[PDB]
Amino acid sequence: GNPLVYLDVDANGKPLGRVVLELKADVVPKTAENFRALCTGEKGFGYKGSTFHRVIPSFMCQAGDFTNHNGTGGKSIYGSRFPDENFTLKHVGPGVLSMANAGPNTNGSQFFICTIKTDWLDGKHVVFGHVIEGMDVVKKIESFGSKSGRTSKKIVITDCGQLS
Numbered sequence: 001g002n003p004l005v006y007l008d009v010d011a012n013g014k015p016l017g018r019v020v021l022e023l024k025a026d027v028v029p030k031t032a033e034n035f036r037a038l039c040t041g042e043k044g045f046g047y048k049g050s051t052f053h054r055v056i057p058s059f060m061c062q063a064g065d066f067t068n069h070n071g072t073g074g075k076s077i078y079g080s081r082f083p084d085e086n087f088t089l090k091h092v093g094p095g096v097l098s099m100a101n102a103g104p105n106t107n108g109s110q111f112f113i114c115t116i117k118t119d120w121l122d123g124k125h126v127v128f129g130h131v132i133e134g135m136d137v138v139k140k141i142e143s144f145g146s147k148s149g150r151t152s153k154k155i156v157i158t159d160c161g162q163l164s
């Protein structure tokens with residue numbers, strides 16, 4: 001079955017709760033496996049302790065830069081970047097989990113959770129999962145963003161891992 005993973009998120013040092021994500025390994029196994037392993041930390045690096053550094057209300061919440069914490073960094077379990085696996089899953093609505101990138105074939109570790117349908121990203125960002133539980137937490141994160149993406153609270157993934 002497809003992995004279930006979790007992110008436990010704080011804002012300004014107080015817990016918001018847990019976001020549970022299904023990773024669609026049946027569609028995008030390489031992309032799912034990268035995210036899964038970055039949640040468990042089993043390769044010796046990953047999302048634990050990193051931040052949602054770019055959050056835009058009515059768009060998305062972006063995280064995963066565990067090296068530079070600002071959108072310039074992150075790395076995959078395979079190397080610094082890996083190819084776009086496919087574009088089969090679409091940005092259909094709130095709760096979609098998708099890879100951030102800097103152009104074609106530049107997936108690393110940065111990712112975003114959509115808070116609206118973002119159809120213009122179809123064919124450009126690899127969708128690889130969705131929120132199973134914790135959209136309330138996502139809406140809290142979203143509420144601490146701004147048009148510029150700068151967050152108004154420090155949003156930290158304090159813990160993360162694999163549920164199944």
Ligand SMILES: CCN1Cc2cc(CNC(=O)c3cnc4[n+](c3C)NC(=O)C4)ccc2NCCC1=O
Binds near residue numbers: 071
């Ligand atoms: C740098 C190369 N590089 C890291 C890398 C960079 C981006 C691109 N960065 C962004 O898209 C991004 C991030 N954060 C913010 N913005 C943007 C546009 N705008 C904001 O206001 C905040 C996306 C993925 C990776 N990982 C793959 C590994 C890799 O080769």
